[PDB]
Amino acid sequence: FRALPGPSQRQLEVYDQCLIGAARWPDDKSNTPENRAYCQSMYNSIRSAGDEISRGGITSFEELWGRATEWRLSKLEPLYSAFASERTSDTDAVTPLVKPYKSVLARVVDHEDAHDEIMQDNLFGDLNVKVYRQTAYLHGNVIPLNTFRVATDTEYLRDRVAHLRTELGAKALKQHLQRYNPDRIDHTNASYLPIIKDHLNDLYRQAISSDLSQAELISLIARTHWWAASAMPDQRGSAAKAEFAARAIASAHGIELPPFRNGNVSDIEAMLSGEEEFVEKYRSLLDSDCF
């Protein structure tokens, strides 16, 4: 193809490098030694991958996702397999909305696109819930992605959770709450990963062309970020990988993306919006202020 500019000589200030890939929950780690280092490591590996991208050394999004995974893996451990494996279609992916995701609860309850449904549970019964349903549109067809659930009948919950503990046992209850916690995220069905990965490859292929306005480039990057994160392709570490890939693509063009603002967790911000919506706000999620 045609070599790109590659990472810029003018680098981010060190305190920003140390915030790359951080998870700055508005309700809370990013200041710790190990996280600063982890973030500076990500910033550096992104530039390394960027150099390669600019030279035509990484020809597929899958290849780039592979580089991101290798990096994240070197930062690890029995959970190794989870961070290294893709999600298989014979499974479901669920993230309970518990620490450190508490800030998400409110984001779902007060979301403009949220609605009230009834969530039947063979233990708690039918529960009233605020529901946000992330969907995407590819090739003319809707494809449901992540679904957020937050139960409102709190009182009933705390009391009922109690009786169950003693009736079924903590062990069994936890086994159940781990998958069907009243407040949780049911992630994009693994069955869509094949079609989505192919799409990510087309976005990548386009973001690798040397003739694009900066604006177009940023939007392409925000899109790629949205798809990669919302799809949550791997069993573990998808957010980290999605951000790595986005930044790398940017770095390959000489763009030095700043860290995400405090309070803005990129993957969560993505799962809470539609594609265009996220693309239009992407810039504002990034801390690009001088002072």
Binding site: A82, R87, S89, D90, T91, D92, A93, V94, T95, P96, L97, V98, K99, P100, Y101, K102, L105, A106, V109, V150, A151, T152, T154, E155, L157, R158, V161, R165, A170, K171, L173, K174, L177, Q178, R179, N181, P182, D183, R184, H187, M232, Q235, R236, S238
Partner: peptide, 23 residues
């Protein structure tokens, strides 16, 4: 209180993405 219903719950769910076999 939207998630404080499981106060001091010994069986609380762990805060991260878990995978399960499709039923």
């Amino acid at each position: 209180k939207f998630g404080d219903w499981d106060e001091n719950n010994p069986s609380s769910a762990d805060g991260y993405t878990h995978i399960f076999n499709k039923v």
